[PDB]
Each structure stands twice: as structure tokens, then as C-alpha cells.
Amino acid sequence: MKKTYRVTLTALGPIFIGGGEKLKKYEYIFDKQKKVAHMIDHTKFTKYLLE
RNA sequence: ACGAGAACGCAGCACCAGCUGUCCAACCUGAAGAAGA
């Protein structure tokens, strides 16, 4: 018989699963002073470029 | 000066009426977006 089991996972360390790779900053912004990286809303990015 | 002369085997008539090319059936099975030193 089939028995379901709800599973909870707590990452003790950092866990990374990839979905894509990007080179130096083209699809994101990196403020080196504040150690903060911003990902640009790409459709709003192209609307802004058109504007 | 023919057992012969003259004489449409012709007229009207729907190969037509009823009937599902239908019934059953997962595009499915397995696979770490991942690793040197």
C-alpha cells in the first residue's frame, strides 16, 4: 500500500540548486560598498529602456 | 401481279425506405543542474 509522508527540510548550511548562470554584471546590479546585489525586473528594464 | 397489303410489343413506374464507423485504453517508465584540489 502507498503511504504519504510530509517532509520538512532545514538547511543546516547553505544549499544551492542551479537554474541558470550569468556572467559579470549584465542581468543584475552589484553595489560593492554595501555587499548587496540587486536583480533587475527585466521586463520593466526593457520598458524603461524603451522609455 | 410473292397467303399477300398496311401495323413501333408499345404506354405509366425514383432500386427505393430504416440504420452514429461506433465501444474499451494516462504518451507513459528511470534520471541530484552537478561535480577537481
Nucleotide nearest to A17 (CA to C1'): B33
- Please tell me the experimental approach by which this structure was elucidated: cryo-EM
**CA/C1' separation A39–B3 (Å):** 127
Burial degree of A16 (CB within 10 A; 0-12, 13-18, 19+): exposed
| Euclidean distance between CA atoms A43 and A25, whole angstroms | 17
Burial degree of A40 (CB within 10 A; 0-12, 13-18, 19+): middle
**Protein footprint on strand B: which nucleotides are under 7 Å from a CB?**
33-34
What is the stated resolution of the deposited model, in angstroms?
2.6
